[PDB]
């Protein structure tokens, strides 16, 4: 009967859809590797899909996935055991080396562009006429780290122009240079900005940007990586 034919058909369709969906989710990070970077013997039952090519806007070229995968950076880790599946210990300073929760990816060293090909993220001082419209304005507040010591002062907000939101606080340190802190890792209070992730002595080590009025995808990844790594690595001084 028709209902029997329909339910049987539906289960065959669904098995094909799951096959299609799983192969689509293998366009990054595959093939699988041994801890030494060599291709693993066992890849599982699903094959790599045929490559697709994204045409990136604003003349920034193409991306073909799957494609050749490398970290394009040195990984300061060593094995802690003689067999697979144990942790890899940092060989230096995991915050400086960018491993564990302080990891960053070698994204393009260009800033994200909006739909008109202008920089997505600008300091508010250079964004006509963006202003704080609601909530406490953090500009001028001292910044305190998890050691309850003052590390600097907020001197601007970096804004996403197309989405009209705050992405970083620009902080001025004791020595007059600035750092970006991601908005999602600070608490704005009436009389201060508080940073759980970092102690005061770790603010100077936040990676610097190379232009004062733009931030690149690579730089965002180094800054956000570094600040998140403080949750684990600044924990002796919280």
């Amino acid at each position: 009967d028709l209902a029997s034919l329909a339910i049987y058909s539906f289960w065959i369709f669904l098995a094909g859809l799951i096959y299609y969906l799983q192969t689509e989710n293998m366009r990054e990070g595959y093939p699988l590797e041994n801890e030494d970077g060599t291709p693993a013997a066992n890849q599982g039952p699903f094959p790599l899909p045929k490559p697709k090519t994204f045409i990136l806007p604003h003349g920034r070229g193409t991306l073909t996935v799957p494609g050749p995968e490398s970290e394009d950076r040195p990984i300061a880790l060593a094995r802690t055991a003689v067999s697979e599946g144990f942790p890899h210990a940092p060989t230096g300073d995991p915050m400086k080396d960018g491993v564990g929760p302080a990891s960053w990816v070698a994204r393009r060293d260009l800033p994200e562009l909006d739909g008109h090909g202008h920089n997505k993220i600008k300091p508010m001082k250079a964004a006509a006429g963006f202003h704080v419209s609601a909530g406490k304005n953090p500009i001028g507040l001292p910044v305190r780290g998890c050691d309850l010591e003052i590390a600097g002062k907020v001197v601007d907000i970096w804004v996403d122009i197309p989405e009209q939101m705050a992405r970083f606080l620009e902080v001025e340190l004791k020595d007059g240079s600035t750092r970006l802190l991601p908005m999602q890792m600070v608490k704005v209070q009436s009389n201060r900005v508080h940073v759980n992730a970092l102690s005061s002595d770790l603010f100077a080590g936040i990676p610097t940007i190379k232009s004062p009025t733009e931030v690149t995808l690579l730089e965002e990844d180094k800054i956000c990586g570094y600040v998140a790594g403080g949750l684990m690595y600044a924990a002796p001084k919280r």
Partner: protein
């Protein structure tokens, strides 16, 4: 800090948006900015695009709504105290089984149901056309229109396709708050309990799965928002530590993972399969299977 609500709002000039091949003559101007909305999402209201299809859908949609409303007022003996008291109990019912698929039923006994339904039919389909055309004008894929078609399938089956195959409009759903719940309950009893309909069971699994998946996906993107996770398109074009930590959370938890693009393929399908399997389950009820208990006993 959890990133459920913004700590600071910023505002700049109203965003009139991208042009591409859009006819700007048919865009309104920006509406006001809502500080309230701005704690959770965007403050900007408008602009909206209103071409000929937009006006047709909006007028038609209001005629469907007003047609039900005038019938509710009639039923309330034009008394605003009764209208409010009995609001959930009013019902515009379809024509009786006697009139079959005929458009000849008097207003007070199902003619008004057919008029409201006609208006609803124009409203929904013109709105479908609008989701396709607004995507075309911006050069985007038609994902939204194909996904909407899945909702339209279940609606089309309940009110149109199934009533036609059964040979009467009496089989269609009445316009009323409590009356459409009674119809839903009644439908299950008459067809020997829908829990035995395997398509109804799959629909539930996908409805469930949609809540599981958006809980997972929403939580995941907020957990990696400290590395710019919500910027999903640029993370597709150039994988960052946000996409890597998101993948590895799930790999380490349950043994497999998604890409930043691929999670949206899981998302669109989990959702469309709700109304897809649902519409099939309803289409087969009373047309092919009188009783799901009985069918289940023969597995066939």
């Amino acid at each position: 800090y959890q990133n459920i609500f913004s700590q600071v709002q910023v505002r700049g000039p109203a965003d009139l948006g991208m042009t591409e091949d859009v006819n700007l003559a048919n865009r309104s101007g920006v509406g006001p900015f809502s500080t309230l909305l701005g704690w959770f999402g965007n403050a900007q209201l408008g602009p909206i695009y209103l071409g000929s299809l937009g006006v047709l859908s909006l007028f038609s949609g209001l005629m469907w709504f007003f047609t039900i409303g005038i019938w509710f007022w009639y039923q309330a003996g034009w008394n605003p105290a009764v209208f409010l008291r009995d609001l959930f109990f009013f019902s515009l019912e379809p024509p009786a089984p006697e009139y079959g698929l005929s458009f000849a039923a008097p207003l007070k006994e199902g003619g008004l149901w057919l008029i409201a339904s006609f208006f609803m039919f124009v409203a929904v389909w013109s709105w479908w056309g609008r989701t396709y055309l607004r995507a075309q004008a911006l050069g985007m894929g038609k994902h939204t229109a194909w996904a909407f078609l899945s909702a339209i399938w279940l609606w089309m089956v309940l009110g149109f396709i199934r009533p036609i195959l059964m040979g009467s409009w009496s089989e269609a759903v009445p316009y009323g708050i409590f009356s459409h719940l009674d119809w839903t309950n009644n439908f299950s009893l008459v067809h020997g309990n829908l829990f035995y309909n395997p398509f109804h069971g799959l629909s539930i699994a996908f409805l469930y799965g949609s809540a599981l998946l958006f809980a997972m996906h929403g939580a995941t993107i907020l957990a990696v928002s400290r590395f710019g996770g919500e910027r999903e398109l640029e993370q597709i074009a150039d994988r960052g530590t946000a996409a890597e930590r998101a993948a590895l959370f799930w790999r380490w938890t349950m043994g497999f993972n998604a890409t930043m693009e691929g999670i949206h393929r899981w998302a669109i399908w989990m959702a469309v399969l709700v109304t897809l399997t649902g519409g099939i389950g309803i289409l087969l009820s009373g047309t092919v299977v009188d009783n799901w208990y009985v069918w289940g006993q023969n597995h066939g």
